[PDB]
């Protein structure tokens, strides 16, 4: 704006109070040490805990949170003064310092759903995952114009001044002009907590300098800033002051005590807990239990290799729960998003939006460190087929447009299902081509179950009738609590246990000699990890590892 | 070659297969992402 007040006493009092806060003399000088760190490290944004501001003066914190603009400006001026007093030269180097807010906020810590209009002109915090994102452009904030004719200099804050007072030419002094970078991003509420009934709230976030590269599309970010309004269409925007990444990852104690392994074998019922109304395919249940669990990050130093990106494909005959099992995972989904068929929503596409060219992250990106449910895999087009092959291997999606080159994190897993177009039995011809998918994609997946309806009336009869009797005329939530605790477990391997896996692995190697053996060695890490994750044990049990060996044998039948 | 799209239909009729068959297979194998379908996508995009 540029409009100022002439010796405001309230502004002066705010400046004095914040300056007193900054000069922590009676305390150890924690913020003063932070000022030293920022001066040395060449960063010009000081993050101040709000809890300290409450402790020193609740009135200051209250007036800040209720009227963001003036208090923020005053506190910025206070920071400038304090820096100059400690070191004038560093202050002379830069134009204006910015201040960020972190800590704990009582009632202003909201969600995009919660962020109604009532929080206008108040500092807010928003939690979610980035959806749309735009490129880095420079935005002008102070343009310096010099007139060669009149020998005068004109400076303006923020059409562009092109003619002087008397239409003389104006050649701008670019160097004296200040340009700051700018970026437009968006956010959506978290998948698990936003109800699926009502419409989603999208909030626009504008980032100033030192914020363009701190958050990238697809991550999980907390944004704190001023919720202002631009001037027939009225749109809310959020000018941000601090961006921090997120994704680090009660009755639990009762759950923990109930889930002690010393009582009985919970794994027997645990596997059945996912397919309540499906008889048989118990091996499939174990694999599906495996897919949800398992680690998704390994400390692969000075490089990268196979990680928790392990996934399961399901191709089989219709009505064999191939379509149905996906819904069971989707219903009890820890951080999982559904997608099916073509799904032309830009897995990494921009759609080339004109009069604007934002980067709309797709389904696989929104599901970072989760599980993705995909129906009718063969329905996806070759355009996706080319992209989807690379995603699973390296773990990121490459966006290739004219000038826009960036990879989004895709630390993800896939649970894919596709109908065998017209294939009926898939027993005489090799599944490598009978499923249509001849591509090398098949090798990438860990598991490929074939759910044929072989005429087995003894086993088949029980599936038809007993499922109908499951109504029970005369524990869904449990797994939810389990998986959250299991996610923070890193079941380290034991060499004596590890050798036991190789010892029986030899017998399988000669069995399949007469399906890839070169990858099977790596997936043995996952399978052993899954069993210990069920027991929350830090070490793999040999008996548990034994069932891992059996699973590979059951894997190919 | 020589077994292009304009003559493959008549082969089914020669085998006493009416026009009903061509929809079930011929019109469905190209939608599968067959190389022959991709062959038309690149070579015949402007050449026709």
């Amino acid at each position: 704006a540029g409009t100022v007040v002439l010796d405001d006493v309230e502004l002066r009092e705010a400046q004095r109070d914040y300056l007193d806060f900054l000069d922590d003399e009676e305390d150890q000088g924690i913020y003063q040490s932070k000022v030293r760190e920022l001066i040395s490290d060449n960063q010009y944004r000081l993050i101040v805990n709000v809890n300290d501001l409450r402790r020193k003066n609740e009135k200051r914190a209250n007036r800040l949170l209720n009227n963001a603009f003036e208090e923020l400006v005053a506190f910025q001026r206070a920071l400038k003064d304090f820096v100059a007093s400690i070191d004038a030269t560093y202050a002379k180097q830069y134009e204006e310092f910015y201040v960020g807010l972190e800590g704990s906020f009582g009632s202003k810590h909201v969600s995009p759903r919660t962020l109604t209009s009532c929080f206008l002109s108040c500092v807010v915090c928003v939690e979610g995952i980035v959806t749309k994102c735009s490129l880095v452009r420079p935005k002008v904030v102070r343009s310096v114009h010099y007139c060669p004719a009149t020998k005068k200099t004109i400076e303006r804050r923020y059409v562009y001044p092109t003619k002087d007072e008397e239409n003389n030419p104006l050649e701008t002094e670019y160097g004296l002009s200040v340009y700051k970078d700018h970026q437009t991003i968006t956010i959506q509420e978290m998948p698990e907590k936003a109800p699926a009934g009502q419409l989603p709230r999208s909030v626009d976030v504008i980032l100033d300098d030192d914020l363009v590269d701190k958050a990238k599309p697809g991550d999980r970010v907390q944004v704190v800033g001023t919720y202002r309004c631009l001037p027939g269409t009225f749109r809310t925007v959020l000018i941000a002051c601090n961006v921090k990444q997120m994704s680090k990852d009660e009755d639990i104690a009762k759950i923990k005590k109930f889930s002690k392994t010393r009582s009985k074998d919970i794994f027997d019922q645990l596997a059945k807990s996912l397919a309540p109304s499906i008889h048989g395919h118990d091996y499939v249940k174990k694999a599906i239990l495996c897919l949800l669990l398992g680690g998704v990050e390994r400390d692969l130093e000075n490089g990268s290799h196979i990680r928790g990106d392990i996934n399961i494909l399901l191709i089989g005959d219709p009505s064999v729960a191939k379509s149905q099992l996906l819904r069971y995972v989707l219903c009890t989904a820890p951080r999982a998003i559904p997608t099916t068929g073509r799904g032309s929503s830009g897995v990494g596409l921009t759609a080339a939006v004109t009069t604007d060219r934002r980067l709309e992250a797709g389904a696989m990106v929104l599901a970072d460190r989760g599980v993705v449910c995909i129906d009718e895999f063969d329905k996806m087009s070759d355009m996706d087929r080319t992209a989807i092959h690379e995603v699973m291997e390296q773990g990121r999606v490459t966006i290739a447009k004219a000038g826009i080159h960036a990879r989004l994190n895709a630390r993800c897993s896939v649970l894919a299902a596709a109908n065998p177009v017209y294939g009926r039995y898939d027993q005489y011809k090799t599944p490598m081509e009978n499923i249509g998918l001849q591509d090398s994609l098949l090798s990438r997946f860990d598991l490929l179950f074939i759910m044929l309806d072989q005429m087995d009336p003894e086993q088949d009869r029980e599936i038809s009738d007993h499922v109908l009797r499951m109504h029970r005329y005369r524990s869904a939530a449990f797994m939810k609590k389990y998986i959250h605790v299991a996610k923070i477990i890193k079941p380290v391997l034991t060499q004596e246990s590890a050798t036991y896996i190789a010892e029986e692995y030899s017998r399988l190697r000669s069995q399949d000699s007469m399906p890839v053996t070169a990858r099977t060695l790596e997936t043995l890490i996952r399978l052993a990890t899954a069993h210990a994750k069920a027991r929350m044990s830090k070490t793999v049990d040999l008996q548990d590892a034994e069932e891992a060996v059996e699973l590979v044998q059951y894997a190919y039948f | 070659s020589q077994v292009s799209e304009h003559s493959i239909i008549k082969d089914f009729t020669k085998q006493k297969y009416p026009e009903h068959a061509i929809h079930k297979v011929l019109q469905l194998m190209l939608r599968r992402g067959e190389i022959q379908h991709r062959m038309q996508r690149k070579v015949l995009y402007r050449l026709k």
Partner: peptide
């Protein structure tokens, strides 16, 4: 439409009834 009677949706038919 003018398993032998399937044009492009060999799944929708399973979801309906065979009604004349």
């Amino acid at each position: 439409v003018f398993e032998d009677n399937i044009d492009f949706m060999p799944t929708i038919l399973s979801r309906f009834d065979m009604i004349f």
